[PDB]
């Protein structure tokens, strides 16, 4: 629906929608920008991520409310409405994964861009895995695992341990281990090693980079405090 808008106008409107807290609009503008076929800048990648994380975050929060009501109940209405929200969440995940596969990831040559997109691929397979219950659930989980793993391999070879995308990737892969893969010891080990290796690299950073890194480092510490 955004094929007739200029790329730069779509980007400008995505930023306006963020200020207006209109995240569905933001996501549609950023989807249109991606479909122009040009690679995304660092700032544009962040806009894409923020938009869809907010959209799917609201859907996940609703799904969790309805799932809890449904489990306490165990008429068809609660199940039906949970299924409606579930289907809409899966549709958004499929949309993002489709943008990544056509053709963001294959054109991402730099480590920063490629890791960013593989992290997103892991995240949206994780969100699919949160609601999955059928024949493909193990394959959905393994698709999340495989995307996170390739991103970690690249990030460990190509990025400093304090890089915010590397830190966020490890954070989310550790949540995957704890919440999805039923591997809490793997989750704890990854969070601790990531935190310790970033701590030892802080001395190389400017004050602004230091603020970025320690912000995500605190989320790793919050989880370790919750998990141990």
């Amino acid at each position: 629906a955004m094929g007739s808008m200029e790329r730069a106008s779509l980007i400008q409107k995505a930023k306006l929608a963020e200020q207006a807290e209109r995240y569905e609009d933001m996501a549609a503008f950023m989807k249109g920008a991606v479909e122009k076929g040009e690679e995304l800048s660092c700032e544009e990648r962040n806009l894409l991520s923020v938009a869809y994380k907010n959209v799917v975050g609201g859907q996940r929060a609703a799904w969790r409310v309805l799932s809890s009501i449904e489990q306490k109940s165990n008429g068809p209405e609660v199940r039906e409405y949970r299924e409606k929200v579930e289907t809409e969440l899966q549709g958004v995940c499929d949309t993002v994964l489709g943008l990544l596969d056509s053709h963001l990831i294959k054109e991402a040559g730099d480590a920063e861009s490629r890791v960013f997109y593989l992290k997103m691929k892991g995240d949206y397979y994780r969100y699919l895995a949160e609601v999955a219950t059928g024949d493909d659930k193990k394959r959905i989980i393994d698709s999340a695992r495989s995307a996170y793993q390739e991103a970690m391999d690249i990030s460990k070879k190509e990025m400093p341990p304090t890089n915010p995308i590397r830190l966020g990737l490890a954070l989310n892969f550790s949540v995957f281990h704890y919440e999805i893969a039923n591997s809490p010891e793997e989750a704890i080990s990854l969070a601790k090693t990531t935190f310790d290796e970033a701590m030892a690299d802080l001395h190389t950073l400017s004050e602004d980079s230091y603020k970025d890194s320690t912000l995500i480092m605190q989320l790793l510490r919050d989880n370790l405090t919750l998990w141990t």
């Binding site: 923020v50 994380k53 995240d123 966020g168 954070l171 989310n172 949540v175 704890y178 919440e179 995500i216 989320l219 919050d222 989880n223 919750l226 998990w227």
Partner: peptide
């Protein structure tokens, strides 16, 4: 209930 990456 654990924290994934967030702004």
């Amino acid at each position: 209930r654990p924290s994934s990456w967030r702004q």
